[PDB]
Amino acid sequence: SSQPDPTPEQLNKSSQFTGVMGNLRCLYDNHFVEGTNVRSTGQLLQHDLIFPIKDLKLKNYDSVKTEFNSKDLATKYKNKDVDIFGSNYYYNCKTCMYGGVTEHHRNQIEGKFPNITVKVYEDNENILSFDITTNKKQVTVQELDCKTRKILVSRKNLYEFNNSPYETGYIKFIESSGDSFWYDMMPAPGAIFDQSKYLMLYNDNKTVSSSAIAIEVHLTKK
Amino acid sequence: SSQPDPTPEQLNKSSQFTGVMGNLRCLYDNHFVEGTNVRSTGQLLQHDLIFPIKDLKLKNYDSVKTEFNSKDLATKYKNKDVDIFGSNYYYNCYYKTCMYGGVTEHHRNQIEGKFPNITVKVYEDNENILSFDITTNKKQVTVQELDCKTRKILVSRKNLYEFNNSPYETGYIKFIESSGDSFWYDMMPAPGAIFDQSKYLMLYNDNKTVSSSAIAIEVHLTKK
Structure with a gap:
């Protein structure tokens, strides 16, 4: 509930x-990672997905890795065209984030x-x-x-x-x-x-x- | 068949x-070119026809040129009152706006x-x-x-x-x-x-x- x-x-x-x-x-x-109609180019573990989102603004990353709390979520958007929006970090990680994925179409x-x-x-x-x-x-x-x-x-x-x-x-x-x-x-x-x-x-x-x-x-x- | x-x-x-x-x-x-009971005002080659259809809505064209896959088709509607309906384009239309077919006799x-x-x-x-x-x-x-x-x-x-x-x-x-x-x-x-x-x-x-x-x-x- x-x-x-x-x-x-x-x-x-x-x-x-x-x-x-x-x-x-x-x-x-400030600025947040933002991707429009992109497809995952790979992944490291069964809980994440890597997207070829480049930073045109400050050139701080050539791709982004997002993590989910389950393999299901990663499997779900694995081969879909999606939109991405979120807060990224570099600390432990190219730049990472978590979630922030929605299906682009419709x-x-x-x-x-x-x-x-x-x-x-x-x-x-x-x-x-x-x-x-x-x-x-x-x-x-x-x-x-x-x-x-x-x-x-x-x-x-x-x-x-x-x-x-x-x-x-x-x-x-x-x-x-x-x-x-x-x-x-x-x-x-x-x-x-x-x-x-x-x-x-x-x-x-x-x-x-x-x-x-x-x-x-x-x-x-x- | x-x-x-x-x-x-x-x-x-x-x-x-x-x-x-x-x-x-x-x-x-959006919109499609539409003309009612019009008559061709000219043509560039033997397989097209130009109609004086004006864009009253957005004022994007004062006439339209339609192309057919044959001369026969152009000859058929050349001097007839016709109705026009179709999807138009503006990239590589010289004679404005162009199209293909979309012509039917108006009468009957x-x-x-x-x-x-x-x-x-x-x-x-x-x-x-x-x-x-x-x-x-x-x-x-x-x-x-x-x-x-x-x-x-x-x-x-x-x-x-x-x-x-x-x-x-x-x-x-x-x-x-x-x-x-x-x-x-x-x-x-x-x-x-x-x-x-x-x-x-x-x-x-x-x-x-x-x-x-x-x-x-x-x-x-x-x-x-």
């Missing part, structure tokens, strides 16, 4: 993270793109609202998350180079049925931030209808 | 076409009352999963007009052609006349990165026509 909302004791405290928050910020303040939106509203709450107060878009009928939650966080960094300093103005923060997605789930936007405690480990949250390749999804960002101020 | 149905190997594979499928899509997704061909319902059966991997009807106002209608109308719906409803490529690997449209005689057209582009519109539309240059009240259409596609 759906995931129970977070308890304050269930959320990571940014104040307890002592590393450089800029390592998390760089995963969302998924292209014609005409007006859907307006997905993001309601931002600070200490339970709807303080800001903005819309994001997509060109996909069925879009990965990752693409929506990425686009939302980018705006949150640019407009609300969600992540700063050192730490964050917010103690806790989670992004909640609600589908038409009322079913919801959320992601912790803050890093685990300690001085080290493992990017390859954090982005693993996107490996379920979860997708939703772009015209039937609501987003809520809940933050607590320091 | 009739054309043998296509073998899998006789059909173009969209996956082998690397250009922009949108160049083929644009030939069947106008349908009075209820227009015929031409059923289109759509098959995906040999499974009839969808059927829809198209119509026309002509007793004897060109198969170009029927093809055009069918593909337009297929693009709008089944994403037959997308901007990049297509959800279907192979695809052909088959026409069957009352006698059982049939023929088909390959709906997929030739392999490679280039799509020649003027070359593709040549399939309509025989100006083939059929009875609108005695024709069946079948679309056979294979999924990717």
